[PDB]
């Protein structure tokens, strides 16, 4: 009837996968309807800068990339059950957001 | 340029010495044995080791090879 979305975002692929697996395991233990863990497209932030600090020599460039991993989990559970599912140790560098879908 | 680096050659020779009755003339079964009998961070090296182990076994069938001593 009422559906709630968990959004897990991180820079660390291993950390976000571990948190998503932990949330899935908790949801399965709680026996709630789960609309799968959806892997949203990974987003790459790219910045290219000159390698030199002075402008001398061959114009060599440096490319830095930062990857963003996002997962969403849809479940039918009230606020107390969702809070009990989400309350555990978590990991650093990842964040989980609660939303209510209408 | 498909020469087997000394790391690959030494690992394959050690594999042949340690497991000889457990190997075969094909590449895929040898590689399947290699995955269990060796620990490595890479799969390209495992494939190369399996290929050179198959080559070593084919040579060993015809005659003894230098660097490998079967007790």
């Amino acid at each position: 009837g009422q559906t709630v979305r968990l959004t897990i975002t991180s820079r660390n692929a291993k950390a976000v996968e571990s948190v998503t697996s932990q949330l899935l395991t908790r949801a399965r233990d709680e026996k709630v309807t789960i609309h799968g863990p959806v892997r949203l497209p990974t987003r790459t932030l790219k910045i290219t800068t000159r390698k030199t600090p002075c402008g001398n020599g061959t114009n060599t460039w440096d490319t830095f990339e930062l990857k963003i991993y996002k997962r969403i989990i849809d479940l039918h559970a009230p606020t107390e059950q969702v809070k009990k599912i989400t309350s555990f140790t978590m990991e650093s560098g990842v964040d989980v957001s609660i939303t209510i879908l209408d | 340029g498909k020469i087997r680096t000394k790391t690959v050659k030494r690992a394959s020779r050690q594999v042949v010495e340690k497991y000889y009755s457990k190997l075969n003339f094909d590449f895929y079964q040898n590689k399947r044995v290699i995955m269990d009998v060796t620990i490595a961070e890479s799969k390209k090296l495992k494939n190369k080791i399996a290929g050179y182990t198959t080559h070593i076994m084919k040579r060993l069938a015809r005659g003894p090879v230098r660097g490998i001593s079967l007790k």
């Binding site: 290219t48 061959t58 114009n59 060599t60 460039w61 490319t63 | -």
Partner: protein, 144 residues
């Protein structure tokens, strides 16, 4: 009544992806992006699209309705993807609704005429590198 016979295939050339749906029907028609083959322009690309049909023959595509949705790439890549999708959809339909004595003969003719009719082209754009105007060409060098 009668069971629906559906087969979906895909053909890729560069970025272009063409999804072809093949269904049994009373009257055979083939439309690429909602456009009939005769209405497809230019005659250069329409010839390439019809190459999928004429290699094996019209009797195999008879009573078969095929629609193609192509997305990405330019006109030439879309045409190649569409023809590959049509050829792969024919072979797939025969594989699912006919014996293997045939279908293999159709595959033989397709492969003999053109490998790319049934097998996707692996070529893709090479990335651009700094200090180079393109993938290969380098910045102009001056001495005096």
């Amino acid at each position: 009544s009668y069971a629906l016979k559906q087969v979906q295939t895909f053909g890729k050339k560069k970025t272009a992806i063409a999804v072809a749906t093949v269904t049994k029907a009373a009257q055979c028609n083939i439309k690429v992006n909602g456009v009939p083959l005769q209405q497809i322009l230019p005659d250069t690309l329409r010839a390439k699209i019809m190459e999928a049909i004429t290699v094996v023959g019209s009797k195999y595509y008879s009573r078969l309705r095929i629609d193609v949705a192509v997305h990405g790439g330019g006109q030439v890549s879309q045409a190649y993807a569409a023809r590959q999708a049509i050829a792969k959809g024919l072979i797939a339909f025969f594989q699912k609704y006919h014996n293997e004595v045939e279908k293999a003969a159709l595959k033989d003719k397709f492969l003999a005429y053109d490998k790319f009719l049934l097998i996707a082209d692996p070529r893709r754009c090479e990335p651009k590198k700094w200090g180079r105007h393109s993938a290969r060409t380098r910045f102009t060098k001056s001495y005096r």
